[PDB]
Enzyme design. Sequence first.
Site, PDB file in Angstrom:
ATOM      1  N   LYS A  17       0.804  -1.216   0.000  1.00 39.61           N
ATOM      2  CA  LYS A  17       0.000   0.000   0.000  1.00 39.61           C
ATOM      3  C   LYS A  17       0.834   1.261   0.000  1.00 39.61           C
ATOM      4  O   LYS A  17       0.570   2.224  -0.715  1.00 39.61           O
ATOM      5  CB  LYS A  17      -0.931  -0.025   1.200  1.00 39.61           C
ATOM      6  CG  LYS A  17      -2.065   0.940   1.077  1.00 39.61           C
ATOM      7  CD  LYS A  17      -3.348   0.373   1.654  1.00 39.61           C
ATOM      8  CE  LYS A  17      -4.592   1.247   1.269  1.00 39.61           C
ATOM      9  NZ  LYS A  17      -5.826   0.803   2.004  1.00 39.61           N
ATOM     10  N   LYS A  36      11.415  -3.859   1.282  1.00 38.53           N
ATOM     11  CA  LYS A  36      10.078  -3.246   1.302  1.00 38.53           C
ATOM     12  C   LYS A  36      10.186  -1.739   1.280  1.00 38.53           C
ATOM     13  O   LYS A  36      10.529  -1.115   2.276  1.00 38.53           O
ATOM     14  CB  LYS A  36       9.343  -3.682   2.554  1.00 38.53           C
ATOM     15  CG  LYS A  36       7.884  -3.319   2.574  1.00 38.53           C
ATOM     16  CD  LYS A  36       7.163  -3.978   3.723  1.00 38.53           C
ATOM     17  CE  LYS A  36       5.780  -3.364   3.882  1.00 38.53           C
ATOM     18  NZ  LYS A  36       4.992  -4.133   4.972  1.00 38.53           N
ATOM     19  N   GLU A  85      13.087 -10.969   5.018  1.00 38.70           N
ATOM     20  CA  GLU A  85      13.577 -12.285   4.595  1.00 38.70           C
ATOM     21  C   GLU A  85      12.832 -12.607   3.288  1.00 38.70           C
ATOM     22  O   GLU A  85      11.655 -12.237   3.127  1.00 38.70           O
ATOM     23  CB  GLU A  85      13.268 -13.338   5.666  1.00 38.70           C
ATOM     24  CG  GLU A  85      13.494 -14.748   5.243  1.00 38.70           C
ATOM     25  CD  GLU A  85      12.935 -15.766   6.260  1.00 38.70           C
ATOM     26  OE1 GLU A  85      12.948 -17.000   5.985  1.00 38.70           O
ATOM     27  OE2 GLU A  85      12.468 -15.342   7.350  1.00 38.70           O
ATOM     28  N   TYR A  86      13.524 -13.269   2.360  1.00 42.19           N
ATOM     29  CA  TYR A  86      12.942 -13.630   1.057  1.00 42.19           C
ATOM     30  C   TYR A  86      12.087 -14.914   1.110  1.00 42.19           C
ATOM     31  O   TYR A  86      12.531 -15.953   1.646  1.00 42.19           O
ATOM     32  CB  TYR A  86      14.060 -13.758  -0.002  1.00 42.19           C
ATOM     33  CG  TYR A  86      13.615 -14.244  -1.364  1.00 42.19           C
ATOM     34  CD1 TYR A  86      12.511 -13.702  -1.987  1.00 42.19           C
ATOM     35  CD2 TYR A  86      14.302 -15.268  -2.020  1.00 42.19           C
ATOM     36  CE1 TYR A  86      12.090 -14.177  -3.230  1.00 42.19           C
ATOM     37  CE2 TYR A  86      13.893 -15.752  -3.289  1.00 42.19           C
ATOM     38  CZ  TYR A  86      12.790 -15.204  -3.877  1.00 42.19           C
ATOM     39  OH  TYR A  86      12.390 -15.680  -5.101  1.00 42.19           O
ATOM     40  N   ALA A  87      10.852 -14.817   0.593  1.00 47.53           N
ATOM     41  CA  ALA A  87       9.943 -15.972   0.551  1.00 47.53           C
ATOM     42  C   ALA A  87       9.865 -16.411  -0.916  1.00 47.53           C
ATOM     43  O   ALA A  87       9.105 -15.846  -1.683  1.00 47.53           O
ATOM     44  CB  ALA A  87       8.578 -15.577   1.070  1.00 47.53           C
ATOM     45  N   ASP A 130      -3.887  -8.864  11.285  1.00 45.96           N
ATOM     46  CA  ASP A 130      -3.993  -8.726   9.831  1.00 45.96           C
ATOM     47  C   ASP A 130      -3.544  -9.995   9.110  1.00 45.96           C
ATOM     48  O   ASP A 130      -2.779  -9.957   8.150  1.00 45.96           O
ATOM     49  CB  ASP A 130      -3.160  -7.544   9.391  1.00 45.96           C
ATOM     50  CG  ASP A 130      -3.464  -7.096   7.981  1.00 45.96           C
ATOM     51  OD1 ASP A 130      -4.610  -7.282   7.552  1.00 45.96           O
ATOM     52  OD2 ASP A 130      -2.569  -6.519   7.317  1.00 45.96           O
TER      53      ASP A 130
HETATM   54  N1  LIG Z   1       9.464 -11.089   1.482  1.00 42.93           N
HETATM   55  C1  LIG Z   1       8.578 -11.087   0.488  1.00 42.93           C
HETATM   56  N2  LIG Z   1       8.683 -11.972  -0.610  1.00 42.93           N
HETATM   57  C2  LIG Z   1       7.766 -11.991  -1.672  1.00 42.93           C
HETATM   58  N3  LIG Z   1       6.691 -11.205  -1.743  1.00 42.93           N
HETATM   59  C3  LIG Z   1       6.542 -10.322  -0.702  1.00 42.93           C
HETATM   60  C4  LIG Z   1       7.395 -10.215   0.423  1.00 42.93           C
HETATM   61  N4  LIG Z   1       6.972  -9.239   1.269  1.00 42.93           N
HETATM   62  C5  LIG Z   1       5.830  -8.777   0.670  1.00 42.93           C
HETATM   63  N5  LIG Z   1       5.541  -9.415  -0.509  1.00 42.93           N
HETATM   64  C6  LIG Z   1       4.403  -9.170  -1.395  1.00 42.93           C
HETATM   65  O1  LIG Z   1       3.883  -7.856  -1.127  1.00 42.93           O
HETATM   66  C7  LIG Z   1       2.477  -7.882  -0.816  1.00 42.93           C
HETATM   67  C8  LIG Z   1       2.232  -6.724   0.136  1.00 42.93           C
HETATM   68  O2  LIG Z   1       3.377  -6.389   1.041  1.00 42.93           O
HETATM   69  P1  LIG Z   1       3.182  -6.641   2.645  1.00 42.93           P
HETATM   70  O3  LIG Z   1       4.390  -6.083   3.249  1.00 42.93           O
HETATM   71  O4  LIG Z   1       2.888  -8.133   3.044  1.00 42.93           O
HETATM   72  O5  LIG Z   1       1.898  -5.802   3.021  1.00 42.93           O
HETATM   73  P2  LIG Z   1       1.580  -4.243   2.884  1.00 42.93           P
HETATM   74  O6  LIG Z   1       0.376  -4.063   1.860  1.00 42.93           O
HETATM   75  O7  LIG Z   1       1.219  -3.774   4.314  1.00 42.93           O
HETATM   76  O8  LIG Z   1       2.817  -3.694   2.378  1.00 42.93           O
HETATM   77  C9  LIG Z   1       2.234  -9.309  -0.310  1.00 42.93           C
HETATM   78  O9  LIG Z   1       0.896  -9.596  -0.516  1.00 42.93           O
HETATM   79  C10 LIG Z   1       3.233 -10.134  -1.152  1.00 42.93           C
HETATM   80  O10 LIG Z   1       2.718 -10.590  -2.405  1.00 42.93           O
HETATM   81 MG   LIG Z   2       0.175  -4.179   6.100  1.00 37.48          MG
END
Ligand SMILES: Nc1ncnc2c1ncn2[C@@H]1O[C@H](COP(=O)(O)OP(=O)(O)O)[C@@H](O)[C@H]1O
Ligand SMILES: [Mg+2]
EC number: 2.7.11.1
Length: 263
Positions: A17, A36, A85-87, A130
Amino acid sequence: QWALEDFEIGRPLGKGKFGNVYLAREKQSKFILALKVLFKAQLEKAGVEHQLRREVEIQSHLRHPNILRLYGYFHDATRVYLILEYAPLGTVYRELQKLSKFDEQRTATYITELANALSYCHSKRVIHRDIKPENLLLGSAGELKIADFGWSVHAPSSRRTTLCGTLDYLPPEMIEGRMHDEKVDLWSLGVLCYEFLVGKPPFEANTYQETYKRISRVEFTFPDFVTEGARDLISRLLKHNPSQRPMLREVLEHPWITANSSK
Ligand SMILES: Nc1ncnc2c1ncn2[C@@H]1O[C@H](COP(=O)(O)OP(=O)(O)O)[C@@H](O)[C@H]1O
Ligand SMILES: [Mg+2]
Ligand SMILES: [Mg+2]
């Protein structure tokens, strides 16, 4: 410590977001992680500086296999960066889009890994608030990992007055404002267990005021393919009263859970 100029940015991992999440390698280490990116401008305009603060603090001191780690963070003139961390396997959201529905074996295991991580969080008095397919990531061995602790809180809490949120996974107390506890995550773990088996949340609706009604009324039905074992576990979590909701141990022990889960 860290600086943007320390990292090699890869492809966009996902869309948040307050900014997208990217892949990235550490320049001397060659360590792959997820960066991020958050825009200060947007964060300010929304007054969520305190949420990013808690997310960073809480998640950083967390240590659990089924919990996405948060190594560090740093920043610059325009945005803030979170070193996560990487997923590899992405989200449970995408996996749900791919398979439409998950079997009981896959759902039971996804529930145990989640009940374990949640237990670890609640033991430290931390509510995620959440939990949903988008914030649930899959690891190298396909293991589950809860991430995005943006709404996470060290507490007994009330709301922050606002709500961007697909009510779907939110509990009655929160949706209405009350003083909630860690029992909200048990509620989400019910919505989640239902969505994994049916393919959609139990209180889905076409509007935010229609969904609001069904969640507060606790209006949901089970499709025919939903076994009796799953129906029982789901019907225990989705209580309108935070007290009635079961404990994470009753979940990790539940007959349906122990008969289908592999972890
Ligand atoms: N470490 C990560 N590896 C791969 N995809 C990620 C990772 N962190 C976030 N994402 C992707 O980013 C989307 C949104 O980021 P997230 O940090 O989980 O929420 P927000 O909307 O609060 O930023 C997730 O739904 C996912 O698809
Ligand atoms: Mg969030
Ligand atoms: Mg998210």
